[PDB]
Amino acid sequence: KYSNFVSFPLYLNGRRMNTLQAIWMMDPKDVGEWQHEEFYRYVAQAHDKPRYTLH
Amino acid sequence: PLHSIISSTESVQGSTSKHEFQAETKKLLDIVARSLYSEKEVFIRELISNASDALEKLRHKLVSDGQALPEMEIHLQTNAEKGTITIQDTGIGMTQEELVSNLGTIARSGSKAFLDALQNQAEASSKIIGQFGVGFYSAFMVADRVEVYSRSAAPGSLGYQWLSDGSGVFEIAEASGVRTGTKIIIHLKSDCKEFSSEARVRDVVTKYSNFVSFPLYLNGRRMNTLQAIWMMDPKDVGEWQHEEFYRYVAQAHDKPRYTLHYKTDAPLNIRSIFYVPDMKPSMFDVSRSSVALYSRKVLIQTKATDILPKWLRFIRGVVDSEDIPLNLSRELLQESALIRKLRDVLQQRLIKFFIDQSKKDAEKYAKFFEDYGLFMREGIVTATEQEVKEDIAKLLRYESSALPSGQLTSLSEYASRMRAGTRNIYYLCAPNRHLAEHSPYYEAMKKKDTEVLFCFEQFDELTLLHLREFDKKKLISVETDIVVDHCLSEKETEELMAWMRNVLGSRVTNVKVTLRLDTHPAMVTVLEMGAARHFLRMQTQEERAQLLQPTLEINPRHALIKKLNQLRASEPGLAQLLVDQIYENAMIAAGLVDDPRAMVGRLNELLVKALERH
Amino acid sequence: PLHSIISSTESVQGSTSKHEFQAETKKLLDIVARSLYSEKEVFIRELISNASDALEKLRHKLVSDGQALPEMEIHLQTNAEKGTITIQDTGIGMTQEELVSNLGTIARSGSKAFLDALQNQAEASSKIIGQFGVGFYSAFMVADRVEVYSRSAAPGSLGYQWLSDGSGVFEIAEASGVRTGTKIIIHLKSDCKEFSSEARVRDVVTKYSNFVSFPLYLNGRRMNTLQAIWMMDPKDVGEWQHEEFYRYVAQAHDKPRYTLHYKTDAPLNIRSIFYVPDMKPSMFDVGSSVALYSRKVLIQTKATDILPKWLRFIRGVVDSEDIPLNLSRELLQESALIRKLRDVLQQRLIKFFIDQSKKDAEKYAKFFEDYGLFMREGIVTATEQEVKEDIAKLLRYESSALPSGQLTSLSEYASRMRAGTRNIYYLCAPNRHLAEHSPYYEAMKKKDTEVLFCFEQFDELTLLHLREFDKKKLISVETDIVVDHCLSEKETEELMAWMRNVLGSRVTNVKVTLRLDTHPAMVTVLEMGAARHFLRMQQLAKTQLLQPTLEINPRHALIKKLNQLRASEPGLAQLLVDQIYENAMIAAGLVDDPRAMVGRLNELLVKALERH
Amino acid sequence: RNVLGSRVTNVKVTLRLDTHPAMVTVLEMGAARHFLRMQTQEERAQLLQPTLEINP
């Protein structure tokens, strides 16, 4: 809930929790169209695709 | 009817001449642009592959001298009002001589000569796609005017141009202000205007050249961020990378339950990855193989070869191999010997992987076998070699009477605790263990101290009779064993026996007496129990019993037979109804009844008239 | 912002030069040698096609002069001693300038010039195969040296000799003693000596060019031995020839029961034949032996499925002279024309069966019983609503308002249906005896509507997937009951709630129904069709409960008997209540495996009969 | 049924009415009333099942 997007690897009993990139800090020319949909499905907690994308 | 005109009268008289082969430059373009490529949008796969090769050559030229690598990009542009497409890269480019020695000659490729002068064939041979030299002319399928702006990357070259219309004549001139690289402009035809929208173009770049080695920007936004994880060593990829890749290829939002990373080179070069979905298989899995071939990081679009066995269609992944041959259409040489042995190599590795999973974990494998157990049974049915049958059979799981309930045993584990010299395997079919132990067939076999498997799910009888052998051991069903092996007074039984020989002279062909029953009133035995249980499903009652030979057995100790004795004196009318129901009860207990709706009418008649004394 | 570098800063300032396209034959021969044909034995098929083309050119030249025709036959020999294969014919022949023009040039064929110089497009436009010009070079796959001897048919032409090794250079010289026609001496490569055996060659000839239009021989023994009736008219061909052809295409021994001769050329040229076997469908049944032909040579697609999937039981051959072909002489995958060819054949085959039903009603009845599975499958495996109805007209059912022993279709069922009614009622049962006595039929006996009886399995699924016919809804008897809108009330209700206390675990809701006469109980659910499949579809495959509403007939003796059993034998009454539930469950078709009820059934009769 | 078949799926008779020539009965009348206002006769009547009863 709180520190999912830490900039360093995080381990809890061996496994790692971050497993995601902060696409709002990266340049638009360095992120593909596939990550733009997976990130949306995480923040919106849905299973559909976005019809618009503003960066 | 034998005659021929073959002789040896031919001879040479004059001095022999010499000549060389020519080629017609007009029909060759017509053949390539009309009857070579089946599908139309393959003209940008060739253009992208050409672009990705110029960048590779430039990078190789800037590492021998240790120079700084500039930006490497591939840009796609689509126009609607002008109806044009655009491709641009930043490769080595082409000089004036290179624009005519490569773009002007059919079946001539400059990339082939580049590798021939390397003398290494180690790192660049596996990263260059061009092999034939005719892929550029695929643009003429949808284009009437082709336009190329290119200049070499050499320090001091000049910009040039290249115009043609596919009529065998092309014009070349000089241009000013051309950026280093190569830009190609295509004017779409009247009937080929579908390639002017982002929706159509995006559906092709992703399908064919999604995993190109260099960044690709379509009209401003890139689509080349996800990297190919099937090439590097498995030690470099984490759990998250495996999870992310599966969601893309399988188009699923869940987590894979198994992952395999196969890399072999001694028999043949193979790079592949396989995934097993966690969710229970859907009906689309059964109805047709979720594996796409890749060669040098471009789709091959097989969709008709089935490089993986049909029983292994439930796994998702990709296979990469540079040893497979391809024809002029960039597709497989169908039914080739090399593509046949790859399937056998892949099949044996997958079976071995599942066996190792069972040893590593049993509770996880039990869940997997419950879900995807249908495919393994189908593979045994649709196989030919016994070695193939036995290899798949190791994945089957059953439970036996010698072990506590709820515990599954393998065939090999069962095959380690027989007697000294008994080459027999016993199995019994039943819906539940409650009916398995209470089955009359099992009760007759309690006389021996042996272990028998209990198979519950359907098609188990069909699968076992098709296997027919496991480790040189014969598979014998319990019902087969009972036939093949080799109270009431006697006076009170001989007078009773003649009745059902007459009143059931049509549906019954044999009635005998058997003491081996303790909790069941009657037993029905048939010679070919396995065949009769399955031939009935493929295919009234008199016909169903004529070819069945329903041998019947009785239990003198049972109270039902004891109570039927006085049924002679008091009410002989009810006697005919009761004996008919006993036969039907035994038939259902023997599993030789397709549907019990017919006997419902007689059951109601007996009940409403027999228990009227309450 | 969008990261783009596409601009329009380019300009033209130089001079325009003119150049022509070139081609290197050293690499062009490389492509054809191994990266063109998947199979290795296709070289003989090309040579036979080339030999037949030579004879066609000679024949058309004679009819122009109107003179007698000499012998016309093709010979091929195998010489296993030195490992050579020879093909000879009596064609037109080629001169020294014709050798270099045709043989020495890639992608250039002399047939197209002859075809374009016809100006009628009927004499030879339907019998010339060659259209690419690279067929001859396919022989380099297995040949390390090629010898060609030929003399033209002109009265005075001389022979010539032609040598090549596939290295990009060929040799031409004058030859003496070569007779009219063409002869090709081929020396086999070390790894491809299997073609020196007669058994291997005989397989290929009968596989690709078995139906050539000229007398073909192998070691002097003729191999054609039959004609191609699919190119002829329906009237000249007799039944005996119509019977001999069937035994060859299907590799069968019986006689066909149906025969269709289809010949149309308006949308696209078709000359095809079809056959329906007499024997029952085999286990293997459940290119489908409809192998496509073009110019009397096999195309060997085996994957395009020119015929619909449900039409996998009929035999025959399809011929077309306008199918687009790949450079490797294979059908162009995913073509617009091939899609319209499949649809055209589907309509004609469906129409043919409709006409056969009207002409012979009894014959179609026997045919329906044998191959009924395929028709039902096609309805389920269809996507268009119109095509589903086209297949639906072939179905045959039995109605309640007619005597036993006759069948009626659905089209005439709607022609005898009342104007107010706008739906069709159907009932599922093994036999008509079990259909009339089924409780659901007796519930709907009040009205005067007509209900069809369907016996064979998956009939309800076929109707469920169809759901429409002539814009009339299909509603089963089971569906109509739920949507429809002596055991005193005090005695009944108090005993009625007793069932709830002991059957509430399974029977969620329960009521009393009075429209019964002989069935002591019923079981009804909302989605009877889905439940009768879903409860059986789950138990079939381990892949991806319900609310059984049980009805009680108060005027039945068995139900009336339970009134005086609660006070006397409460323990035995519970056994009878469960048995009644099982009996009604079986008659509804939703029962589980009946092995379970055997144990409970036996335990009831052992105690209930303990009084005599 | 011939003239209102598109809009009416079933017609019946009620003898309990004496002051109204027409009556419409729906399975879930309360749910239909509130759901209709939030969301021409053909597509509306498809989701309402407007059974028609006429007092003779």
Ligand SMILES: Nc1ncnc2c1ncn2[C@@H]1O[C@H](COP(=O)(O)OP(=O)(O)NP(=O)(O)O)[C@@H](O)[C@H]1O
């Ligand atoms: N965009 C480009 N930039 C620079 N050189 C190019 C480009 N496209 C093509 N070439 C050169 O022109 C040659 C002819 O193109 P092409 O027909 O694609 O041959 P190929 O790609 O190497 N073999 P193929 O697999 O049939 O495409 C190539 O081999 C390159 O040397």
Ligand SMILES: Nc1ncnc2c1ncn2[C@@H]1O[C@H](COP(=O)(O)OP(=O)(O)NP(=O)(O)O)[C@@H](O)[C@H]1O
């Ligand atoms: N046996 C022959 N007799 C006479 N002319 C021949 C013979 N073989 C070849 N030719 C000629 O040589 C040309 C080249 O042969 P070929 O490669 O078969 O071209 P094609 O048959 O016309 N087109 P294709 O369908 O690819 O075979 C033919 O078109 C003929 O004109």
Ligand SMILES: [K+]
């Ligand atoms: K080229």
Ligand SMILES: [K+]
């Ligand atoms: K030629």
Ligand SMILES: [Mg+2]
């Ligand atoms: Mg290329």
Ligand SMILES: [Mg+2]
């Ligand atoms: Mg030819």
